[PDB]
């Protein structure tokens, strides 16, 4: 189907299908589908246009998802990067921000291994 700018996968149970939306994950799925009253055990084939309407209305109502969410998170990172906060210096360097161990690991921040 089509929901909030996304394209829902061909066959998935709806609680898994809604997770392709960038602002939603399994728990928010078991919230949204409980509130709307749409069974989570349905396919994406058996979804209707009306059901898509109730869904879009609800999750645009109480939840921020997708593009606005990304813009907002990016906005938080550049917010703390500008004020010259410690975490900001870390984001600049491309190192681990949470106080983790940079002597050995941290490759997921640094990226692939570049030898000397």
């Amino acid at each position: 189907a089509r929901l909030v700018g996304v394209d829902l996968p061909r066959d998935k149970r709806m609680e898994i299908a809604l997770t392709y939306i960038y602002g939603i994950g399994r728990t928010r799925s078991n919230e949204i589908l409980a509130a709307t009253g749409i069974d989570k055990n349905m396919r994406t084939k058996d979804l209707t246009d009306d059901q898509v309407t109730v869904l879009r209305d609800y999750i645009e109502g109480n939840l921020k998802v997708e593009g606005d969410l990304r813009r907002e998170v990016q906005a938080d990172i550049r917010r703390k990067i500008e004020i010259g906060c410690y975490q900001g210096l870390r984001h600049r360097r491309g190192l681990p921000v949470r106080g983790q161990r940079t002597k050995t690991n941290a490759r997921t921040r640094k990226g692939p291994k570049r030898t000397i």
């Binding site: 089509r2 246009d49 898509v52 309407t53 879009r56």
Partner: protein, 59 residues
């Protein structure tokens, strides 16, 4: 209008969840398009601080 080379241009009717109807030309051979969002629906057409975040917590 060279005769054969073009895709067929049908008459078409566009229907929306907000009730708006449109009568247009389209390439859809059915001749009917049901669509979710339009010029009337969309929140852009219709127009839809750290210290505050501090005083909300503590105040």
């Amino acid at each position: 209008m060279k005769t054969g080379i073009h895709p067929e241009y049908v008459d078409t009717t566009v229907q929306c969840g907000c009730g708006h109807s449109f009568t247009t030309r389209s390439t859809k051979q059915s001749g009917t398009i049901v669509v979710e969002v339009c010029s009337q629906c969309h929140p852009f057409y219709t127009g839809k601080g750290r210290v505050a975040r501090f005083e909300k917590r503590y105040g």
